[PDB]
Enzyme design. Structure first.
Site, PDB file in Angstrom:
ATOM      1  N   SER A  43      13.033  24.363  22.186  1.00  0.00           N
ATOM      2  CA  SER A  43      13.881  25.549  22.186  1.00  0.00           C
ATOM      3  C   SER A  43      13.802  26.485  23.392  1.00  0.00           C
ATOM      4  CB  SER A  43      13.661  26.355  20.907  1.00  0.00           C
ATOM      5  OG  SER A  43      14.332  25.738  19.818  1.00  0.00           O
ATOM      6  N   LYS A 207      10.452  33.506  24.444  1.00  0.00           N
ATOM      7  CA  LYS A 207      11.251  32.507  23.741  1.00  0.00           C
ATOM      8  C   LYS A 207      10.318  31.324  23.536  1.00  0.00           C
ATOM      9  CE  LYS A 207      14.351  30.370  21.574  1.00  0.00           C
ATOM     10  NZ  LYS A 207      13.217  29.951  20.696  1.00  0.00           N
ATOM     11  N   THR A 208      10.076  30.989  22.277  1.00  0.00           N
ATOM     12  CA  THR A 208       9.193  29.888  21.921  1.00  0.00           C
ATOM     13  C   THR A 208       9.923  28.546  21.877  1.00  0.00           C
ATOM     14  OG1 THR A 208       9.599  30.483  19.613  1.00  0.00           O
ATOM     15  CG2 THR A 208       7.536  31.253  20.595  1.00  0.00           C
ATOM     16  N   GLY A 209       9.136  27.480  21.777  1.00  0.00           N
ATOM     17  CA  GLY A 209       9.675  26.135  21.691  1.00  0.00           C
ATOM     18  C   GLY A 209       8.747  25.301  20.827  1.00  0.00           C
TER      19      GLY A 209
END
Length: 264
Positions: A43, A207-209
């Site tokens: 993401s 913003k994480t993934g």
């Protein structure tokens, strides 16, 4: 150096592959670990996609307010916001906010549809001199993170430089870069990642993934107490396809690379 050895040690402890890139705007310096290696973005790839929309809004007034219809067939796994707007639809601004702050996957796909596909996001990346970023698939396929598979990957340093350019730099117009910063600062999914390894009073926009092979990522702009902003990217992936996520590794990496900064 010491940070170098600490990150190598953290990687050994993690039993996986760690990638880090920290840009310190106070003295325009960078601290990296496997900074040029490719990692599945998961993401975190959403930031570049939203930036492409923001760029498009620069020459087309009211674009962010353009309503986009959401069909039931559009819904993919994990779409907390979009699934509630089948009747009302969502504007490009609402889709961008949802994909960034909740990591809503259908929102990303709708944005990709509007732009003209994943290839269009890669094109935008090239337009801001990012020659590493590559988006090849949509959600959920882009999360496979297969070792030796180049699809939907980028490097810590490439993403760090692009994030800097898109928020603090000149890649986007003033209204747009500020809107991106505002969306990032309001993220709801990063409490246990980069933020968890930084002083509680620092402001963070991340913003994480999360993907297959226990891929655990986080990218962010950091505003330390009375200090110029920092840009930090931490990518982590593991050996087994079903590996569990390791946000603790991201938190420690953030602590290691910002320790000196927080002590002075």
């Amino acid at each position: 150096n010491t940070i170098e050895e600490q990150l190598n040690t953290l990687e050994k402890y993690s039993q996986g592959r760690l990638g880090v890139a920290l840009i310190n705007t106070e003295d325009n310096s960078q601290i990296t670990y496997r900074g040029e290696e490719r990692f599945a973005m998961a993401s975190t790839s959403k930031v570049m996609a939203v930036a492409a929309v923001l760029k498009a809004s620069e020459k087309q007034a009211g674009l962010l307010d353009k309503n986009i219809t959401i069909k039931k067939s559009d819904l993919v796994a994990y779409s907390p916001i979009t699934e509630k707007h089948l009747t009302t639809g969502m504007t490009l601004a609402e889709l961008s906010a949802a994909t960034l702050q909740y990591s809503d996957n259908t929102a990303m796909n709708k944005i990709l549809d509007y732009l003209g596909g994943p290839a269009k996001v890669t094109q935008f990346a090239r337009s801001i001199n990012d020659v590493t970023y590559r988006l090849d698939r949509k959600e959920p396929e882009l999360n496979t993170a297969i070792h030796g598979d180049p699809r939907d990957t980028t490097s810590p340093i490439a993403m760090a430089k692009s994030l800097q350019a898109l928020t603090l730099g000149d890649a986007l117009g003033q209204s747009q870069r500020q809107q991106l910063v505002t969306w990032l600062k309001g993220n709801t999914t990063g409490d246990n990642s980069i933020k968890a390894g930084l002083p509680k009073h620092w402001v963070v926009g991340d913003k994480t993934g999360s993907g297959d092979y226990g891929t655990t990522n986080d990218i962010a702009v950091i505003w330390p107490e009375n200090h110029a902003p920092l840009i930090l990217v931490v990518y982590f992936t593991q050996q087994e396809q079903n590996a569990k996520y390791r946000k603790d590794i991201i938190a420690k990496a953030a602590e290691i690379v910002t320790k000196e900064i927080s002590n002075s």
